[PDB]
Nucleic acid binder design. Structure first.
Ligand SMILES: Nc1ncnc2c1ncn2[C@@H]1O[C@H](COP(=O)(O)OP(=O)(O)NP(=O)(O)O)[C@@H](O)[C@H]1O
Ligand SMILES: Nc1ncnc2c1ncn2[C@@H]1O[C@H](COP(=O)(O)OP(=O)(O)NP(=O)(O)O)[C@@H](O)[C@H]1O
Ligand SMILES: [Mg+2]
Ligand SMILES: [Mg+2]
Ligand SMILES: [Zn+2]
Ligand SMILES: [Zn+2]
Lengths: 703, 614
DNA sequence: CACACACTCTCCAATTCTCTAA
DNA sequence: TTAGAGAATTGGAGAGTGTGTTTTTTTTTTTTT
């Protein structure tokens, strides 16, 4: 077969038969092999070497190709791909298998076929806009998955035992169109009750989903359109009911006598043969992270001011509210679940309650967390129910047996449940979340179903006080209207007030008007870009797991004991035992923010500060100052310790001068590791050595 | 061709030599022919089954083990036929009435790590798989034909002892009459019919295996897998059991076009955990015999929880239970103990429920908010397979013989709460709905957790802290009102305990002195429950009588002094509750009689509940 | 199961082609 | 030039094969009570 120098001249054919014949088929095969081997990104890095290597590391049998890259590098393949998608995807699968077995010669033991998936295809279509013009073409659509079958085995290459003799009928390919009837046995011509040879038959995973238009893209009072889609092989369980997805697939039609007799006209059934599923929720998975991305994340973690940067990156368009940003950062990164002895589970997720005045950006904080977090569920007040929050039982739509279904807390199982207008809920709806908040489970005993579902989510709620205005004359317990069991289930408990303060009002006004200028259609520390923050968050949550070695038990124990005393004194907030475990969770969350594999006293002091400041915030005006001096003098607001390193430096300089008269930074840091004062960067940024005329340089190491 | 039969003969011979030659032991100690001995003893007991270990088979001959893994259906019948041969030559001669050799069911187990239900993908069809899960449904046991004979309606031409393939696969009757000439009539289109008197049938059962709760991906519902059980695997498990299934992943063989329904043909069941080995048995005798068994049990209840010793002791009494009785006139007296924990938040009530559900031999946990009357007791519904009304058990039925842990007990609706009165006292559920009229058993303890009406107890409020009715409250043997006491040294010790508890999660889960592991205490509770039912001694009963009268007079005078009725009544059910607690304390020690010491301890525990009343 | 419809195949004989006489 | 006797082709009768069928109750959930 001679190489074909121009695929583009169809010479009167259509694309389907043109690429079906051998010459153009081999030319397409070689072009796709060369594309995979030689395509490089803007930095010159061979992207497909990395992608195939990751696929073979993880045994995933599927290779995502970016259509933008294909169109940029090899034009005619991008030209023919949407016109004859089945044929070219078959050729691409063959070529990808050749390249994969060139890279990893033993990968045939793991797979026998590589599925090339296409992403970022510009041929986006609305479900309501699909026409007969799109038939047998590669389309891209969006919608919410509303139904899913179980993963079912489907015949792909089926063999039949002959009904009389021992012969086996040849491989017949399943089509998605009709049942394959064997015909007659070529040995003996019998055509009786044939039966499938299960052992010699090749099966494939099958899953039929129904997607419909997303409820925010449909018009009000209008019914949504929907399509069936077939997921085959490793595309099964790419989505669940409720998932917003983008779906690339072949728009396929076949004759259906049922539709013909339903309509009275020869109407053909339609289905999408899915090629690529991408959840609009998970725009970036952990598998999508490249070596550049993880190198960026790990190098960025070494900044040593990263905690302030991460805190500042929480809702960068909101002035002030540094304590809110801190608490939301800790909740967003989260702690670690633990189960000592396999018999005592304790939650790792941190729950947050933002109570306070109108127009104080509580809802804006909640919508920011919704936007930034993967697996965010947002709900509001009366719009939620006990049943809808937790889980619900219904007659199955077609078969009519009772079936359990996932509520918001179950759907957010490794994510965030956001409850705006939390005080406006019904008590019966609000009490439903207790088990999910603490025990991280939802137990249902209804209509013959008796089971517990996992609801390991983090609850971030927003509320108003009684009368819609916080009263410093009263404590939090006196003006919230919530009760102790629900108040104690929130680890971080924030009060936001809108009191007059002219200088802060001027700065806030300038920030707000500057924001309106910046975002037109066209604290000090600087934040991360939000894309980088999302990548950092998912890496920190999935690839990093803090472990607590010690936390200086005496400090936290004494703190908890007298925090209990003052809570009993004022009645401002119940403290129970949950606040201790909140301390451990917040320490683990700060360690995760710093990407530490092990928790340290830096994290413990951060958690201590958060707890004490919020508890102080719950108090009245006069009581608040006395509480401030109480917990500040006696307990640990460990701001800095520069004096010890200062006189260690002075002592070392005095001894060195005395030695020389009659590498100092190495001497200093040696003493700083000998004594438990290891955070020396703070001393090097502080003024105490500077006005004493010392200085530092990481290269010269002289001071 | 017959070369396939030659292959079958040699493979059956190799399985026979495995079962004839396999030994365990060492030359220093001695050898025992494991599978010969098991075959002999089971056949003489009339059991006609054995369980073979895949690792033993692989050590003997790895090719046979590989063949069983890859092609279990083909080679398991050869293994079973070899087992039948070995059974014959191991048991011959047999007495009269046992001359006819029986078929042997060969079950399989392995030490291999199991796969998940979601690991079962199309590459593994017809292969041998091992998966865990929970039995959530189990059908009635029914008959599956293993051998049939079919007779032709015209000529009475008969085919005899047709082998029926195991599993949910059926059989195709021949399309045209076999082996005789095409005469007149040639054939009516179904010439054959199954002869009624010649069929050989075996028991079979259908079960639903649910995915384990900790195996489910985040946000997804647990998956279901159908299980086909056969012969002695029928009724080996019930709903609520945790199992490791060994079986053949297969399609049924008599939404989409080429879609086939899959199931697992079970070849072995390992209940994860009706029998105690003698070593466990004598160790349980020892454990009951030692003098501080009550304290050891109480320290074993929820060891990660600081304090609450009286509550743990009452929970131990609830776990062991009293003794159920039927009196000469046919009336039944409840044996189970009902316990309510009521009060302040963050006091480990939910942790105690989560411990008891895991420690009890039979135990179910449910939230009061998430439950209903039908879902707790029993529900009535129509079946899509046959339009008739059937019953489905609720929490009480599923926990019959054990404990229902009702968390959030104050949150359930009152109309749903009145459903469990009969199941709490009479231990029965009388249903009369949709024509079906019956009375099911619900012999289970209720361990309930609840909060105050005002969250905390708020001690000035008194009786207004309780919205429960006297009817439901009188059905609880003990009502522990739990108050979170703010004491400084208590708080320091509790905080250090919690911090150490969180710190120690990485310590490789080492054994501990002076307490019973949960897996052992579960078995011990089951053993004591099935073995020992105590009674009161006479003098002990006299002590209980007099103390009860004193307590009743005190309760009456307290209510009279208050001029208001207390929410907790002191009734004859509370007398019988004290009796049940004393019997549970004796049952911990396996003593046939309850002593004055047991009655005194029961009264001590009950006087916490009487403190909670007065 | 069993009694009507729906469909194919085969054989039989009736019509038309070819060659001859009236 | 008509038409009639013998041979070959086409019409359709009928024998044979295969397919399809015979309001009710309990429970949930949201909204309205
Ligand atoms: N500190 C702030 N910085 C920037 N914008 C702010 C700030 N405080 C309030 N806003 C703006 O105020 C508007 C209202 O915010 P919103 O989150 O709805 O208030 P809220 O906390 O939800 N009050 P409420 O809904 O009655 O509970 C938004 O446009 C915010 O951007
Ligand atoms: N004495 C204790 N020892 C150890 N952990 C404790 C103790 N008391 C409370 N806790 C912890 O507190 C948390 C809440 O426990 P939980 O079982 O929900 O108590 P509760 O009384 O049921 N709370 P609530 O449902 O609001 O009434 C868990 O993480 C427990 O481990
Ligand atoms: Mg708001
Ligand atoms: Mg609780
Ligand atoms: Zn054949
Ligand atoms: Zn016959």
């Amino acid at each position: 077969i001679e190489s074909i120098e121009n695929l583009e001249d169809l010479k009167g054919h259509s694309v389907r038969e043109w690429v079906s014949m051998a010459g153009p088929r081999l030319e397409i095969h070689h072009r796709f092999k060369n594309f995979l081997r030689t395509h490089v990104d803007s930095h010159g890095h061979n992207v497909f070497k990395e992608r195939i290597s990751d696929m073979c590391k993880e045994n995933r049998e599927s290779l995502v190709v970016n259509y933008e890259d294909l169109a940029a590098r090899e034009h005619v393949l991008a030209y023919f791909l949407p016109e004859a998608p089945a044929e070219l995807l078959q050729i691409f699968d063959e070529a990808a298998l050749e390249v994969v077995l060139a890279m990893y010669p033993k990968y045939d033991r793991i797979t026998n076929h590589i599925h090339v998936r296409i992403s970022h295809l510009p041929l986006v279509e609305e479900l309501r806009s699909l026409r007969q013009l799109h038939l047998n073409q590669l389309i891209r659509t969006s919608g919410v998955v509303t139904s899913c079958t179980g993963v079912l085995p489907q015949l792909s290459m089926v063999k039949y035992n002959c009904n009389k003799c021992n012969f086996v009928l040849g491989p017949f390919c399943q089509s998605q169109n009709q049942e394959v009837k064997p015909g007659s046995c070529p040995e003996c011509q019998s055509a009786g009750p044939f039966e499938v040879n299960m052992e010699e038959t090749i099966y494939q995973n099958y899953q039929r989903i129904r997607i419909q238009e997303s409820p925010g893209k449909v018009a009000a009072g209008r019914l949504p359109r929907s399509k069936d889609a077939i997921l085959l092989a490793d595309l099964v369980d790419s989505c669940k009911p409720g998932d917003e997805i983008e779906l690339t697939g072949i728009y396929h039609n076949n004759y259906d006598g049922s539709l013909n007799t339903a309509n009275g006209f020869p109407v053909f059934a339609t289905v999408i043969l899915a090629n690529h599923v991408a959840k609009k929720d998970n725009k970036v998975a952990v598998g999508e992270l490249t070596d550049e991305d993880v190198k960026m994340i790990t190098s960025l973690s070494k900044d040593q001011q990263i905690g302030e940067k991460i805190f500042a990156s929480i809702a960068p368009s909101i002035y002030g509210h540094e304590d809110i940003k801190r608490g939301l950062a800790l909740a967003l990164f989260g702690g670690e679940p633990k189960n000592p002895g396999g018999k005592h589970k304790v939650r790792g997720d941190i729950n947050v309650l933002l109570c306070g005045d109108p127009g104080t950006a509580k809802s804006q904080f909640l919508k920011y967390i919704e936007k930034v977090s993967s697996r965010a569920i947002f709900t509001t007040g009366q719009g939620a129910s006990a049943v809808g929050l937790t889980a619900y039982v219904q007659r199955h739509p077609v078969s009519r047996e009772w079936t359990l279904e996932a509520g918001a807390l179950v759907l957010a199982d490794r994510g965030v449940c956001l409850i705006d207008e939390f005080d406006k809920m019904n008590d019966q709806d609000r009490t439903s979340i207790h088990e999910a908040m603490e025990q991280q489970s939802i137990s249902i005993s209804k209509a013959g179903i008796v089971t517990s579902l996992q609801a390991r989510c983090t609850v971030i709620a927003a509320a108003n006080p009684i009368g819609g205005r916080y009263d410093p004359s009263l404590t939090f317990s006196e003006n919230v209207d919530l009760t102790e069991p629900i108040i104690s289930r929130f680890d971080i408990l924030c009060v936001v007030r809108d009191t007059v303060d002219p200088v802060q009002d001027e700065m806030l006004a300038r920030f707000v008007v500057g924001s309106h200028v910046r975002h037109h259609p066209s604290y000090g520390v600087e934040p991360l870009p939000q894309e980088v923050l999302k990548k950092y968050i998912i890496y920190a949550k999935e690839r990093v797991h803090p472990k607590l070695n010690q936390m200086d038990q005496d400090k936290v124990a004494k703190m908890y004991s007298d925090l209990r005393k003052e809570s009993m004194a004022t009645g401002s907030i119940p403290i129970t035992v949950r606040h201790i475990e909140s301390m451990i969770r917040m320490a683990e969350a700060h360690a995760r923010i710093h990407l530490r594999d092990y928790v340290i006293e830096d994290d413990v002091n951060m958690a201590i500060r958060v707890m004490l400041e919020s508890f102080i915030d719950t108090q009245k005006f006069s009581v608040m100052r006395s509480m401030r001096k109480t917990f500040a003098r006696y307990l640990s607001f460990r701001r800095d310790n520069n004096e010890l390193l200062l006189f260690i430096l002075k002592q070392l300089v005095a001894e060195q001068v005395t030695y020389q008269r009659n590498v100092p930074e190495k001497d200093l840091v040696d003493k700083a590791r000998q004594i438990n004062i290891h955070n020396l960067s703070a001393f090097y940024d502080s003024e105490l050595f500077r006005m004493n005329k010392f200085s530092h340089d990481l290269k010269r190491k002289m001071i | 061709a017959d070369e396939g039969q030659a292959r079958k003969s040699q493979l059956q011979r190799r399985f026979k030599e495995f079962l004839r030659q396999y030994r365990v032991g060492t030359d220093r100690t001695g050898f025992t022919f494991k599978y010969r001995d098991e075959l002999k003893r089971h056949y003489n007991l009339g059991e006609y089954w054995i369980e073979v270990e895949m690792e033993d088979l692989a050590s003997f001959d790895e090719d046979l083990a590989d063949y069983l893994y890859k092609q279990p259906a083909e080679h398991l019948q050869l293994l079973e036929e070899a087992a039948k041969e070995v059974a014959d030559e191991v048991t011959r001669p047999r007495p009269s009435g046992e001359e006819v050799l029986q078929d042997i069911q060969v079950m399989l187990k392995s030490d291999a790590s199991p796969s998940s239900i979601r690991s079962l993908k199309s590459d593994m069809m017809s292969h041998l798989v091992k998966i865990p899960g929970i039995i959530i449904a189990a059908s009635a046991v029914r008959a599956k034909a293993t051998r049939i004979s079919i007779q032709c309606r015209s000529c009475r031409n008969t085919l005899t002892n047709i082998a029926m393939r195991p599993g949910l696969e059926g059989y195709a009757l021949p399309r045209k009459c076999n082996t005789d000439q095409a005469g007149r009539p040639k054939c009516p289109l179904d010439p054959y019919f199954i002869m009624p008197d010649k069929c050989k049938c075996v028991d079979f059962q259908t079960l639903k295996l649910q995915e384990l709760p900790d195996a489910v991906p985040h946000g997804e519902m647990p998956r279901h897998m159908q299980l086909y059980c056969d012969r002695y695997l029928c009724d080996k498990v019930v709903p609520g059991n945790r199992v490791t299934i060994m079986g053949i992943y297969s399609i049924k063989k008599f939404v989409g076009v080429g879609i086939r329904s899959s199931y697992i043909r079970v070849l072995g069941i390992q209940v994860d955990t009706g029998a105690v080995s003698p070593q466990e048995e004598e160790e349980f005798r020892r454990l009951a015999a030692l003098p501080n068994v009550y304290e050891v049990i109480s320290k074993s209840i929820a060891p990660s929880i600081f304090g609450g010793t009286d509550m743990k002791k009452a929970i131990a009494c609830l776990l062991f239970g009293g003794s159920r009785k039927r009196l000469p006139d046919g009336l039944t007296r409840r044996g189970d103990i009902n316990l309510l924990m009521l009060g302040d938040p963050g006091t480990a009530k939910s942790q105690l429920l989560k411990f008891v559900e895991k420690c009890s031999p039979i135990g179910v946990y449910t939230s009061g908010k998430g439950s209903s009357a039908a879902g707790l007791t029993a529900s009535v519904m129509r079946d899509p397979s046959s339009r008739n009304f059937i019953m489905e058990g609720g929490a009480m039925v599923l926990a019959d013989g054990g404990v229902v842990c009702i968390d959030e007990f104050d949150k359930m609706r009152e109309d749903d709460r009145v459903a469990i009165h009969e199941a709490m006292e009479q231990q029965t559920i009388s249903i009369a709905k949709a024509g079906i009229t019956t009375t099911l058993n619900s012999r289970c303890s209720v361990l309930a957790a609840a909060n105050s009406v005002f969250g905390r107890w708020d001690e000035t409020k008194g009786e207004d802290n309780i919205d429960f009715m006297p009817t439901i409250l009188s059905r609880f043997d003990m009502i522990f009102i739990v108050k979170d006491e703010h004491n400084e040294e208590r708080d320091v010790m509790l905080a250090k305990h919690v911090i150490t508890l969180h710190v120690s999660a990485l310590t490789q889960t080492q054994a501990v002195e002076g307490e019973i592991d949960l897996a052992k205490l579960k078995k011990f509770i089951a053993y004591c429950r099935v073995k020992c039912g105590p009674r009161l001694s006479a003098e002990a009963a006299e002590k209980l009588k007099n103390r009860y009268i004193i307590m009743r007079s005190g309760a009456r005078q307290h209510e009279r002094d208050s001029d208001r009725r207390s929410s907790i009544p002191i009734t004859v059910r509370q007398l019988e509750a004290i009796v049940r607690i004393a019997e549970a304390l004796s049952k911990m020690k396996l003593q046939p009689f309850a002593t004055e010491a047991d009655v005194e301890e029961a009264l001590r525990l009950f006087q916490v509940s009487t403190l909670d009343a007065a």
